[PDB]
Amino acid sequence: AVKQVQIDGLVVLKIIKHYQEEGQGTEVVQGVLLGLVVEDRLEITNCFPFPQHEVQYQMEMMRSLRHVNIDHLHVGWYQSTYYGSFVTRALLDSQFSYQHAIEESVVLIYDPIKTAQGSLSLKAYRLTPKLMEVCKEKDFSPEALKKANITFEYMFEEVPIVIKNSHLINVLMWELEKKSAVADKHELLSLASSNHLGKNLQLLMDRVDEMSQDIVKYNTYMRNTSKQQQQKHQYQQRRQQENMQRQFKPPQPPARMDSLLIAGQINTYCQNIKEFTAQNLGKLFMAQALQEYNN
């Protein structure tokens, strides 16, 4: 696997540049990622994004990255999404496409609204091998699902990010910070968000109602099989009594990859809204110290 992901500064500022110009209302917009992986650390130095509609576009740029003596080895692909919801079958299908060429491959899912309200949200996650295991044998089947065991904690493992630069960027960071307009950093401690919290929970509620849809029919699949097992064992006791005196379709379940996909998606709501929870409650409790002298 990959234990560490690390960035150079060029990938992130062009990741903002596809949000800043290109799609503004809500767009899934997407790219490639770049770098070489020196041992136990995935080093990212570049990206180039893809517009909103392919491999011919992807491979033609690979000569271009070689023309200027820049690193040209594809590691993974990034995608912008809405507030907490990136988990789809389509990106995971487009991730195991790139898990197959190189043994290490990544999504850094950039969420532009969680940055604009607060902390930096790039989600650098990687595939667990046991979810690499089920697609290589191509058995999306419940009988091997328990032997090649997948339960939702190893559904997307997380690789931690460490920022790396050269020192001339630190010159240019020192150069810019003096010569600039004074941009105050106040937007972290905002202390009103209830629709950032509201659409976090409302996008969660339709998936639990999607989860409620999945287990209501799971009763009916058992209500299909609990009649049919006894009806065929009635047909066992019907037909076995018949030949002594002389001398059908079983249903499929709901196909169980979507039931694991909803729990891992509700896993994305659970980590973020509770990290959202003390985030606002910290600025609430520092504001207890702000009113504290005023009589």
């Binding site: 509770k274 990290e275 929870t277 003390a278 910290g282 409790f285």
Partner: protein
């Protein structure tokens, strides 16, 4: 249930073991001047010595000099202020920074 007309005026004093123990009057009224301090902020000294079992003002000022009683005259008796025993366990009880930071470290 604070019956004193039986205890001081209808008491059968035929047994000498009540005087056989020393200071039964000073002990059981020490129980009784304790319990009156909760329940009064103004009472007259005529109705005071009636419920304390018929001793005069010649001793009533001596026992009240002991226990934090002033005679604010005609007839009132000073025990304590007003504002102690409204006793709010009030609406403004709070959740502190340290009372929830046990759970706030793991969700973060």
């Amino acid at each position: 249930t604070c019956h004193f007309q039986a205890f001081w005026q209808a008491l059968d004093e035929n047994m000498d073991l009540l005087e056989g123990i020393t200071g039964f009057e000073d002990s059981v009224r020490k129980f009784i001047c304790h319990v009156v301090g909760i329940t009064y902020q103004h009472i007259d000294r005529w109705l005071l010595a009636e419920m304390l079992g018929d001793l005069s003002d010649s001793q009533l000022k001596v026992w009240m000099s002991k226990y934090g009683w002033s005679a604010d005259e005609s007839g009132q008796i000073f025990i304590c202020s007003q504002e102690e025993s409204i006793k709010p366990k009030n609406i403004v009880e709070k959740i502190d920074f340290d009372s929830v930071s046990s759970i706030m470290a793991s969700s973060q």
